[PDB]
Design a protein around this nucleic acid. Structure first.
Lengths: 902, 401, 405
DNA sequence: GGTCGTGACTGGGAAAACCCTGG
DNA sequence: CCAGGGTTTTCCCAGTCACGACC
């Protein structure tokens, strides 16, 4: 029947599906190899467990255009990249005309030939373009100057505000102040900014112009890691850009010639380096899958509307209210300390006993009632006349404790407010007024040796300071992000933020207002860190004339307002592993009621008539590491105990490594995930020691070191469960060119072992898995584009947030789109199998648990993003209907396995 | 809940809520059937009303406040029966059973009712105020006053609650926009004068006809109480209040003539007054001091005197009192206290009473230039000349925001 | 004759300018007098609020022995005005005819004996709070309580009128002295704002119980009407409310402790409001210029706003800035520049005088040039130019100079 | 590792002040 | 006795030091 199993009796792919994908031929491991595998799995003790068979899939898959699967995908990628490959070949043979002698002050585009003559041009139509824009941040979000060298002639784009003098235009932002650029490819340095300036990537219909980033290809060919580039900058040590930002508009119109010369030199040099390294980019990325996936990734599109405006404005306003409350709370504590002066009671407090409290001395008939009142008032004003004494400069509140004066505004200053209005959260009197406790002991500050804690023991330890002769209490320095050799600043630090979460720093006395500013700070940490980034987004508001008729004919369009787009200015290849790293959008954060303005994802909502299909690629990197270990063990699925745990693993049943590590060590879920990831990423024994030191401190250095050694003796074995993957990566590192198992695309030359030898292993160990993830995302986007072009299915790539992938689709094709995604995932796993020589595939691994279809962006379709800045939620303030989740069986039941519209 | 009762004995002792301990029960104060407030409580009600009047009518252009009659006249809560007619009916022994029954039925069918919801007042004055505003929309009519409510006693009773209401007549296109705006503004008003506005909460409720409004509460030490309500009642009530043609019942929004809409606010100011009382007192040596915010505390300046030249000292104190009174501040004339109490006990009494500053006029004021000044917030002394001191106080009030 | 027609024209202005609201059928002099009117308009609400503020400044502010009290709108039972009735119980009882005539009368009495009352005066709340206030002030007789608020009375319907009540607990010896003081202060305060102080007529009187007091009247063209009354109470009221130990009701002057005499000062506010509305009405030379010249301390809105010819947005910005500046300084305003269909300048002046606006402010492009604005007075209608940086101080000075004089 | 924020330590001409003094 | 000189004494703009968000 359709149900079939491996020799390890794990539910593999269905016979029909395996016949459709693999073609012909079934395999089995060798007798000595399978005996070794049986003995090894019996050694680990995980052998001999049941497995409930999942229902199979009987689907007539679409035919594969090619007998070999990898060759068929390579042909598909070549077909996708063919116009852009031809444009890149034209850019290789592109001629650079000499420097024009003049640069016209014309609005929009101006052409300058070999003689530099002025030609009025509207839309330059080169097949290949090299681009660089200049951004005028002094005039809002409007750039000014853009260059375009070409095989024919120079092109200059001058903004509308550059030619005009000052002038008033419409508010907010519109694409009318943006560049209006057969398919075309634009290659340049940070073409994300250019795309933010290019009008042709804002309509919901999509376009055909694509962009190649010389930053991306530069990181693919010759890039550096964080520590390597930092050390290179440190060893290297031993004006127009700043002026252009501060140029407003007149001074930009002043120094035009030198800035244009700088731009021409930069464009020429970048083009020269690009055309030198474009064969390097071609050979170092032999698959056209790389080019096609990068071109699909660099056109990431986000839809927004007026409600995102609310998520900006209200959140900042909300922050203001919260900020106000924080100040008020601090002031209350300050007032309390005044009472401690009474009877020198402050000479007994554990926290507030080392400040400047000493008082400052002071230096030097109706006629009856009418007559009485006038005489009394006259005597009052005569007493008011006694003003020819006392110091003309007033003493700033004498008698009070001196630090309370230091927190108070001077009486003469016009920025005066009642109470200690000058107090901020970061003053040295803030923690002492908070009466902070570090696990049963008070804090203590010294300018000599930073912050620590006093324990009534003098008459275990953490950084002993026997020099600090505090009477009766030993002083132990507070832990820092950089060990005991550094000093901690204000205790309200980012690195102390997790320590704030698990009750390692609580006030206690003053049970309401003491532990309240702590909660406010822990709430406003996110918005305080990211408000500049979120406010700096260049939202572009789409006019209705170029909007699609799908929303225009739909009654759900909001005619009173407008819609718009956010283009993620995300570096596609911005890591050593070219992982999509961007600190604002692609960060691993989710909406909670305990982070202020944490509904950043929640305003990415589809236009009417449209939806978003999301695939959470669960255990992507985990399965990549597991399948590398299994391939290096015996070349099957579940070869190792870790591989079988990957095949047979349920979080509800606890059969994962996470529950076992939580039982063995005693850390949190996130701590276990980070530890297992870093060990997968290649954490060393000192890395494990500092990772355990970063977590809960119920142990010492010796106990944590012994537990780390015992943990190292289990998973890696005598180097066990996963060391075959490590030996695979070592065999990759032993080669002259480090080639990935998935694609063979070599990493940047900084990590080549010719000048490094057996060093910096951890970065490459992470890099193999992350490059496999890059290939996974590229293959997923390639398969989505291929099935869209194959079955005429609408849609657009929305975003690829590291692990998850969101696609912007139209409504009427949603299930059909979801169906394609299912097959795509299978093929992706199959391609990984076809890039590891595996002769089979499990049933459960090839399919995700579910695929989500929604009208708004979120991790799951059950959370409404209840936050302090969105208190009612999406279901009340915005009325957004919740999403739906589907499985392969539900998709098949809804679509009947049909590949076309019914 | 001893501190809640310990606050109550302070609120009874220092003349905030009138009555005795037996009626000092939570339901009696919370249910609007309270036995009355003290003089300082009345001044706190007046301060809350003044701040509401600034926030609602003064700083908003389109709000034209109106006053509707106290009782709703018949035909048609509670009903009213005159004593004279009852006496005439009862004294007429010639009356039979049937005539008395007919009189009682007529009374039940022709009885006015003391009002509960002030929406009907705006629904009565809407046409006149539409003539007033020259058909400028949106707008609204505001009013503060005491309303009358049934008491659902578990042991008839009438509970008197002071309510501030406004009916924002708005275009229907921008209804929920104004609803969110007014929720934000009024929650900011209820959070403006608080020690801990986290105890002020917000929730939303849905009417039976699909209308949605927001509800505000305060985290009392025994559970929430409803402090304000909102209900966008649409246009059913106004249409019901004027059947027939819609020629009068219309308005202009921009260039489009549209039927208006109904928004409502119901603010129980007595509930908020007790709420702010519980916000002021928050439960080392304890110091029973009510920390009211320096805009709603009923008496600002405290003025006293010492032993010595009582004629000249009394002249100076009386002049200072009149000078401060001419500048709008309110002072507690404590200088007439011939019964010499200690400065500790005097300060304790004047700090339970939520007084901003205590000014002490000694003989040294008649010597060179100096008066003592102790702040409630810090309980630390200060010296000042008289001529500066007045301005200090007024800018302190001006720095409340 | 024509005076009543002019008063009706004033009432039609009150309908037009929203001082007094109602209908032409409701325009009856006694209907205004008793309190049968459907209620004053918003400008009348502002007039009443200013009058109440003036009263509160007069009485409770500048006295160290007068404290504010607030008596409830109901008096609970069983008691000795209408009667508060819970309706549902009465309806359910009326549903039965089985009970005979005697049973019906008896249960009507049983309900009646447990029936609360809407109040008639404001005395009884202060009388109940006398024990607490005597404990508060340490018996330093005399001392007073006060309340401004509405009271309901029957008309041969139920009419509500806002009145001001001051209760004076005085030693019996100083009774006539404090009575004369309060009478003189009250008469002067009522004569303070009107154009013709001789019309306020004060007459002494004594009741059937030998209770001395005084009565204030204002002279409408249809005769005299009551504005304010003063009375004595004696000493049986405190014993009636609090029978028992008299020393617990004793207050001290010097060392002598006595049961204090009670004096009542009770005055209508809405009838005096109508009287001042009549007072402000003048005809300045078939129809003359109707000027509603209220006193500046009692006028509803002080300073209006207008726009000139030129830039719409810039003039609106200037008017909005002046509006906000006057809002912060605390002067009542009238932002009525929003009329696109404008009338004549003479008609605009007449309209703003019909609202009894004190001064008319006009803003042109010359304000953008130098900051001067046109300012029209009320009585003489003189048009001057004043800079925009001192108009708020000028109006503050006008209010304060009227207050001082 | 390097860069630009915030807040503590301090410190030197100066504005007023005190003590003493010349005439 | 009224202005001026020697010494106090902070005072306030300014510099100088450290560590935490960012590149």
């Amino acid at each position: 029947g359709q149900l079939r199993h491996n020799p390890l009796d794990i539910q593999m792919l269905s016979r029909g599906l395996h016949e459709q994908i693999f073609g012909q031929g079934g395999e089995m491991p060798g007798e000595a190899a399978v005996r070794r595998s049986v003995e090894h799995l019996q050694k680990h003790g995980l052998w001999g467990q049941p497995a409930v068979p999942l229902p199979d899939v009987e689907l007539r898959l679409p035919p594969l255009y090619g007998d070999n699967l990898d060759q068929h995908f390579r042909l598909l990628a070549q077909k996708q990249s063919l116009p852009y490959l031809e444009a890149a070949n034209l850019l290789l043979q592109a001629q650079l005309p000499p420097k024009p002698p003049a640069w016209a002050w014309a609005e929009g585009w101006t052409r300058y030939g070999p003689e530099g003559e002025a030609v009025p041009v509207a839309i330059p139509e080169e097949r290949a373009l090299v681009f660089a824009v200049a951004v005028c941040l002094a005039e809002g979000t409007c750039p000014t100057l853009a260059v375009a060298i070409s095989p024919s002639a120079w092109y200059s784009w001058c903004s509308q505000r550059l030619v005009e003098e000052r002038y008033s235009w419409t508010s907010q932002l519109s694409p009318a102040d943006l560049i209006p650029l057969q398919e075309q490819l634009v290659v340049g340095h940070n073409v994300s900014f250019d795309r933010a300036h290019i009008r042709e990537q804002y309509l919901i219909q999509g376009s055909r112009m694509r962009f190649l980033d010389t930053m991306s290809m530069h990181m693919a060919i010759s890039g550096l890691s964080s520590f390597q580039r930092s050390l290179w900058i440190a060893a290297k040590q031993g004006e127009p850009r700043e002026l252009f930002v501060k140029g407003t508009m007149k001074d930009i119109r002043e120094n035009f010639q030198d800035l244009m010369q700088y731009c021409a030199q930069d464009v020429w040099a970048t083009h020269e380096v690009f055309q030198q390294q474009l064969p390097l980019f071609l050979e170092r990325c032999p698959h056209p899958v790389t080019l096609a996936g990068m071109l699909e990734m660099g056109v990431s599109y986000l839809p927004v509307n007026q409600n995102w405006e609310r998520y900006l404005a209200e959140a900042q306003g909300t922050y203001e209210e919260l900020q106000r409350e924080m100040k008020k709370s601090l002031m209350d504590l300050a007032n309390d300390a005044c009472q401690l002066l009474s009877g020198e009671r402050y000479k007994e407090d554990p926290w507030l006993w080392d400040l400047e409290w000493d008082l400052q001395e002071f230096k030097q008939s109706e006629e009856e009632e009418f007559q009485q009142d006038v005489m009394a008032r006259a005597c009052l004003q005569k007493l008011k006349g006694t003003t020819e004494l006392l110091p003309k400069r007033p003493q700033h509140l004498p008698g009070h404790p001196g630090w309370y004066r230091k927190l108070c505004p001077r009486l003469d200053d016009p920025a005066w407010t009642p109470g200690p209005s000058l107090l901020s959260l970061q003053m040295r009197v803030t923690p002492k007024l908070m009466a902070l406790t570090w696990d049963g002991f008070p804090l203590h500050y010294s300018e000599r040796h930073g912050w620590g804690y006093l324990v009534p023991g003098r008459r275990h330890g953490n950084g002993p300071y026997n020099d600090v002769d505090i009477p009766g209490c030993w002083f132990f320095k507070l832990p820092h992000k950089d060990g005991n050799s550094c000093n901690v600043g204000s205790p309200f630090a980012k690195d102390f933020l997790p320590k704030m979460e698990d009750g390692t720093l609580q006030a206690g006395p003053g049970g309401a207002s003491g532990p309240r500013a702590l909660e406010i700070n822990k709430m406003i940490s996110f918005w305080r860190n990211a408000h500049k980034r979120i406010s700096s987004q260049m939202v572009v508001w789409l006019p209705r004339s170029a909007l699609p008729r799908a929303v225009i004919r739909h009654p759900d369009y909001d005619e009173e307002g407008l819609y718009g787009a956010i283009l993620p200015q995300v570096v596609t290849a911005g890591t050593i592993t070219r992982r999509a790293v961007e600190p604002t959008w692609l960060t691993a954060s989710n909406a909670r009621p305990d982070r202020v303005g944490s509904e950043l994802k929640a305003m990415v909502q589809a236009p009417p008539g449209y939806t978003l299909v999301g695939a959470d690629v669960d255990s992507q990197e985990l399965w990549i590491a597991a399948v590398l270990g299994d391939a290096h063990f015996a070349g099957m699925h579940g070869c190792t105990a870790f591989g079988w745990m990957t095949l047979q693993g349920r979080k509800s049943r606890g059969t994962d490594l996470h529950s076992k590590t939580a039982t063995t060590v005693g850390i949190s879920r996130e701590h276990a995930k980070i530890f297992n990831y870093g060990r997968i990423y290649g954490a060393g024994q000192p890395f494990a020691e500092r990772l355990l030191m970063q977590f809960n401190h119920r142990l010492t250095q010796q106990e944590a070191a012994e537990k780390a050694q015992q943990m190292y003796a289990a998973t890696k074995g005598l180097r066990g469960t996963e060391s075959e993957m490590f030996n695979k990566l070592e065999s990759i590192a032993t080669s002259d060119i480090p080639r990935t198992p998935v694609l063979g695309c070599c990493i940047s030359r900084a990590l080549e072992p010719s000048a490094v030898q057996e060093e910096f292993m951890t970065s490459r160990v992470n890099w193999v898995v992350q490059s496999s993830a890059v290939d996974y995302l590229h293959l997923m986007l390639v398969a989505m584009k291929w099935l869209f072009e194959e079955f005429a299915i609408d849609g657009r790539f929305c975003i690829s947030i590291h692990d998850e992938v969101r696609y912007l689709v139209r409504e009427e094709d949603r299930y059909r789109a979801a169906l394609a995604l299912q097959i795509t995932n299978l093929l992706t796993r199959c391609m990984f199998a076809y890039k590891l020589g595996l002769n089979d595939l499990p049933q459960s691994v090839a399919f995700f648990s579910a695929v989500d279809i929604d009208r708004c962006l979120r991790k799951e379709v059950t959370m409404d993003c209840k936050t302090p800045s969105n208190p009612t939620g999406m279901e009340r303030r915005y009325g957004i209907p919740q999403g739906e989740a589907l499985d392969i069986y539900q998709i098949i039941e809804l679509t009947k396995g049909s590949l076309e519209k019914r | 809940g001893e501190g809640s009762e310990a606050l109550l004995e302070i609120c009874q002792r220092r003349h905030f809520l009138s009555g005795s301990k037996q009626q000092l029960s939570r339901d009696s104060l919370l249910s609007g059937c309270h036995p009355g407030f003290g003089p300082l409580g009345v001044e706190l009600r007046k301060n809350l009303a003044a701040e509401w009047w600034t926030s609602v009518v003064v700083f908003r252009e389109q709000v034209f406040p109106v006053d509707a009659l106290h009782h709703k006249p018949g035909p048609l809560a509670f009903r009213l029966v005159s004593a004279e007619t009852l006496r005439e009916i009862l004294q007429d022994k010639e009356l039979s059973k049937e005539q008395l029954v007919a009189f009682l039925e007529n009374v039940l069918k022709t009885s006015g009712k003391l009002r509960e919801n002030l929406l009907h007042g705006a629904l009565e004055h809407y046409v006149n105020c539409l003539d007033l505003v020259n058909k400028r929309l949106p707008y609204g009519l505001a009013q503060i006053g005491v309303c009358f409510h049934p008491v659902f006693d578990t042991k008839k009773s009438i509970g008197e609650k002071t309510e501030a209401s406004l009916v924002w007549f708005t275009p229907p296109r921008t209804s929920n926009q104004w609803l969110d705006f007014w929720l934000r503004h009024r929650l900011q008003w209820w959070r403006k004068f608080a020690m801990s506005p986290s105890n002020f909460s917000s929730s939303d409720c849905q009417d039976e006809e699909g209308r949605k409004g927001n509800k505000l509460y305060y985290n009392f030490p025994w559970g929430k109480e409803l402090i304000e309500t909102l209900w966008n009642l649409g246009d059913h009530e106004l249409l019901h209040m004027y059947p027939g043609n819609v020629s009068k019942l219309h308005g202009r929004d921009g260039r489009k003539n549209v039927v208006p809409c109904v928004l409502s606010v119901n603010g129980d100011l007595d509930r908020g007054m007790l709420a702010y009382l519980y916000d002021s007192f928050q439960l080392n040596l304890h110091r029973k001091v009510l920390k009211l915010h320096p805009c709603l505390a009923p008496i600002k300046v405290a003025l006293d005197v010492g032993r010595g030249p009582t004629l000249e000292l009394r002249q100076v104190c009386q002049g200072l009192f009149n000078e401060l009174l001419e500048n709008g501040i309110s002072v507690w004339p404590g200088y007439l206290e011939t019964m010499q109490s200690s400065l500790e006990q005097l300060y304790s009494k004047y700090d339970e009473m939520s007084i901003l500053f205590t000014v002490l006029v000694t003989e040294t004021t008649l010597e060179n230039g100096l008066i003592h000044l102790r702040s409630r917030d810090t309980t630390m002394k200060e010296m000042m000349h008289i001529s500066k001191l007045k301005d200090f106080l007024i800018k302190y009030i001006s720095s409340a925001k």
